[PDB]
Subunit: 89 residues, 10 copies
């Protein structure tokens, strides 16, 4: 799944790759589920989709915390912006 041969990648880079691709996939599921929630015409399906959507958000947050704890720039940049109140830029 990597762009460079594993041969040249440090173990920490590959573990971070595993986490990053996990966040990406959960983010995608969040988005597609939210779209289906809006478009669904069956309320029983809509409740299932909306539930799965919100657990995908939890999966992403758990993996993002792992990245925060194992990558200094992630911790630094996440600390600057997350859980703030003023204008983001």
């Amino acid at each position: 799944s990597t762009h460079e041969p594993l041969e040249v990648l440090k173990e920490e880079t590959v573990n971070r790759h595993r986490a990053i691709v996990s966040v990406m996939e959960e983010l995608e599921a969040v988005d597609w589920y939210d779209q289906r929630v809006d478009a669904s015409t069956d309320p029983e399906l809509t409740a299932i989709l909306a539930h799965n959507r919100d657990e995908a958000k939890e999966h992403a947050a758990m993996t993002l915390e792992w990245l925060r704890r194992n990558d200094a720039k992630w911790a630094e940049h996440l600390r600057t912006y997350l859980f703030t109140e003023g204008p983001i830029t």
Copy 2:
């Protein structure tokens, strides 16, 4: 770029979609630049890749804070896990 027709999607669902795909694309850049930092045999190139990598993390962090502020479950789940101690699970 959306999976359901825009006509059935709420405005704010589409704006969250724009933010989520942005975070996904910045996450992909972080992973790919990080792999290329490891594999590059040109130090001047490596310094550029590393700089771009870490700015992609900042772009992800800003856009993520926007998601947190505009989605009740992103705020709940991010609050649960980010900058915590002890087992993420």
Copy 3:
């Protein structure tokens, strides 16, 4: 995301499409997470990956039950084969 124009599709066919593609995406996550569990060299990440894997199984099971309740041949075939003993064929 549909192969035929929404004008010619029954509303229920589109709802079933929303469910099928959700299950497919959950199955993909189960598989990918399980492969990352085997390959991970960080025990914390492995624990997150395994947790997300097993919740993806739950999401699939939930959505599959919706299909079962909303499609006569899913109900027939799932009842023939699930929770059985002896050769599946």
Copy 4:
């Protein structure tokens, strides 16, 4: 077709991957056949498409049962939700 190198995967993981990808592909045929069934304007084709659709559902059910027999969490989560009444999110 695996995302991690086969050297690091347990044999059982790779066999479950084979089953999972099989279920995914049968589900996709189910969805596409059903959409084609709605859109077809040839009755003889529609009958073939609907026949193939419903056998794809059967292939998926067979492979899902194998997964249930070979994975404790699949067996648990399928047990909880399949063949129930009432809200699924309960």
Copy 5:
């Protein structure tokens, strides 16, 4: 799924399109199932994969017959080569 807009396609062209992509997908399943059958190390799964494989061949054959009945050049070319005996590049 079509490469040209539906407005310019004849209805029968679109029906043949539906038949063709079905056959393609059944063929893809035949091939992947057979590879997984070779590679599987679990005999219970292998029996399932092989059963699904051969049912996919049936799905392809059924849809192929529909194409044969609804397209004269399919009928011509399938008649030239199927169920023959000699070298195939000569019939």
Copy 6:
């Protein structure tokens, strides 16, 4: 092109893979050409596209006969459905 590593695939499985992906690719061409035949506004091009469409049908037919000769379930199911009359799903 294979979904499992070559070192676990039997040679005959890989040859059938080569034949199957060939039929799939010719089928794709038949469909795409036929759609372009409907949409084209230049008659000289249309005649070329149709010629190519129908030669793609022949390529698929030749390769299908190889499959029939090299796989007993292809032989069985194709014999059941090709060149028949009456409902296809009842043969």
Copy 7:
């Protein structure tokens, strides 16, 4: 199949697009068949693959001639290079 909306494309541009992608698809078949001919271990299959390879070349040549007749600079550049002797550059 077009990258710009059909309503802004001239009709001649769309016909050339039909021809160009046909040549591309036939070129791909020539290449893929030639690789399979080299790799095949069944002589009866190989003869079929090679027959189809060389017909895909004929299809490409035919379609390219239509393009040549319908595009002034296809005609000019093909006339410059085809059927020459000496370094192509």
Copy 8:
């Protein structure tokens, strides 16, 4: 980028593969550039797109000539159809 293992491919097959994919990519650029030419509303951009378009045609023609010189059936079939009059089929 080849479909069969390089170990079983003949040297000439791999070189023709490099030439064929090059012709394919130049043809694609001709088509996409021509579509952008029709749709562009900036005259300076349009001039660049058309200029690059006609050079991609020259690149394809050069590479096709190499194929003609290095493949007897390309030579036969191009000779049959290129620079002719009357019905191509």
Copy 9:
């Protein structure tokens, strides 16, 4: 385009046409250069190398168009192109 053309400004769409063109020429530059290294036929190698370097030229032309038509492209290309010393 990733958003509907009806919500996009006309200049935005023209910059899209330019950006995707540069991207496709860059990809050709990269693929041609890899093929130049791997080619075992001398006349082919010369064609690939010629096509490679013309794609670079196409990219340069289309980038200049962007520079003339986007103030941030002009600023950032002015900051870094043709400089001495560390790029970061």
Copy 10:
């Protein structure tokens, strides 16, 4: 991610591949961000998308300068066309 085997590629070819795909990806982000900037109906998001858009341009320029320094034909052609006046096709 290379199309030829790494064995046969010169090291500078692989490093230029790393630079080129980086530029492509930053360019893609410039384009997608700008289209999202046009289409966004939330001004706080728009400000983020637009800031990110303009930093992608800087990333592209930095990497392009590296290519210019490491490739004579990039240096030649960029010198011909960048920061000029008049018809671009003629300089």
